[PDB]
């Protein structure tokens, strides 16, 4: 126990906080900063253009989960919301194609757009601060070539595959200047939007607005924002010999190593460990190993859909939690 | 001045404070659980807990019962401010780590 989540063969134990005054006669762990300030730590294992791996150490499960939930469903992002079909003669229905376009993530920076006001008539609701216009004009024709008969439909037809990169940014008003240095493109240009045959045509434009993942998944900015408690493996008694090799084969390849000389198995990297509790089914390490999870050590893995950097996504989640707390504190309480 | 966001539920409120239910609209487990944890870290609070009465409503009732030291409203205010301070600590640590790397 004592901050360690118990991983048993049939159950998980000690999964709650127990860090408040009123848990015990010692009314300790009462809230104060300069204790959380000195305890809390951030360890960024890796940072990429789309994936961030960082540790939030000595923070509560509720706060970490609040960050995760806000990242998934409360950080705004830009996605197509309305699709206007001028012409679609493809085998894909208009609603299906509109849904696919909406699911296409756009490499357009949020905070460069303004939230659409729903209380406005449709002819004054969409402004150049509210909306991104994406056009798509693709027509299929037979290739004027003579390749082998009935080959793949890439040199057989022209524009047989419609990709997300065929979505063209159409600046409106002042967007010709503000977006000049950062033209809007799909974050994944090679998404297969549609396949179509000679004589078929797709002509549309899509209005892309800010939105919330809680409203629709297309607005979610993370392909997955998640955490995991840092695993803990305690070798209670030395394991050596062929038993050490058997014990080592019950974990992912680089989790625990075999010492040279002393010959005892030892925990080499518990961060690499997925908790399959495969050791807990063998009855020869039953009294030799204790599996656990550090309850206040969170290994966050944030992967961006493409619109913003994962560090920005996480910072926005923390900002959103703080801002909702602030707004609620400022709100007057009504009887 | 948002007079619809947070509401004291007078039916679920004790005389002279120290017990109250607050109805918060457009909020869910995200704020509810973090606020409940922070409030429970208040030594005067003897009962904190929230519930989303129905999934079909963007609504959240948070219950606070204290001892005689403070009122439920004061406990809620302290919890909200402490949540903000926690978020500031997290933001500062994350920013300094991002800058350093």
């Amino acid at each position: 126990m004592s901050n360690i989540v118990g991983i048993e063969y049939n159950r998980v134990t000690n999964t709650t906080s127990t860090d408040f005054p009123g848990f015990s006669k010692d009314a300790e762990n009462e809230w104060n900063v300069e204790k959380f300030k000195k305890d809390f730590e951030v360890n960024i294992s890796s940072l990429d253009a789309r994936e961030a791996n960082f540790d939030l150490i000595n923070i509560d499960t509720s706060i970490a989960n609040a960050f995760r939930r806000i990242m998934i469903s409360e950080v705004p992002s830009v996605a197509a919301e309305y699709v206007y079909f001028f012409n679609n003669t493809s085998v894909i229905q208009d609603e299906v194609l509109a849904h696919r376009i909406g699911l296409v993530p756009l490499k357009v920076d949020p905070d460069m757009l303004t939230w659409v006001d729903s209380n406005l008539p449709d002819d004054e609701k969409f402004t150049d601060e509210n909306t991104i216009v994406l056009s798509l004009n693709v027509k299929c024709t037979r290739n004027p070539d003579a390749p082998k008969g009935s080959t793949d439909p890439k040199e057989l037809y022209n524009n047989a595959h419609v990709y997300a990169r065929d979505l063209k940014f159409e600046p409106q008003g002042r967007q010709s200047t503000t977006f000049a240095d950062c033209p809007v493109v799909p974050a994944d240009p090679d998404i297969l939007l549609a396949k179509l045959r000679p004589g078929q045509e797709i002509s549309l434009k899509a209005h892309c607005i800010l939105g919330i993942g809680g409203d629709h998944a297309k607005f979610s900015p993370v392909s997955t924002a998640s955490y995991r408690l840092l695993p803990q493996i305690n070798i209670l008694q030395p394991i050596k010999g062929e038993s050490a090799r058997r014990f080592q084969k019950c974990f992912p390849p680089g989790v625990i190593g075999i010492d040279e000389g002393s010959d005892e198995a030892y925990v080499k990297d518990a961060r690499k460990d997925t908790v399959s509790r495969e050791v807990l089914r063998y009855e020869e390490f039953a009294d030799k190993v204790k599996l656990g999870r550090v309850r206040n050590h969170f290994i966050f893995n944030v992967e961006s859909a493409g619109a913003m950097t994962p560090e920005e996504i996480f910072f926005k989640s923390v900002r959103i939690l703080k801002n909702k707390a602030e707004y609620l504190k400022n709100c007057p309480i009504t009887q | 001045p948002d007079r619809e966001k947070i509401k004291l539920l007078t039916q679920a409120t004790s005389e002279d404070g120290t017990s109250a239910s607050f109805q918060i609209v457009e909020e869910d487990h995200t704020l509810g659980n973090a606020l409940r944890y922070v409030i429970m870290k208040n030594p005067d609070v003897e009962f904190c807990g929230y519930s989303i009465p129905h999934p079909s409503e963007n609504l959240l009732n948070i219950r606070i019962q204290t001892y005689g030291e403070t009122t439920a409203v004061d406990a809620l205010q302290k919890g909200l401010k402490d949540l903000m301070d926690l978020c500031d600590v997290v933001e500062s640590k994350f920013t300094e780590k991002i800058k350093s790397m």
Binding site: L47, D111, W115, M308 | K99
Partner: peptide, 17 residues
């Protein structure tokens, strides 16, 4: 990476619609 964008970019999208 390792460069702040929240500091330099004003977050407009975070305002309540």
């Amino acid at each position: 990476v390792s460069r702040d964008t929240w500091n330099t970019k004003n977050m407009r999208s975070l305002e309540p619609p």
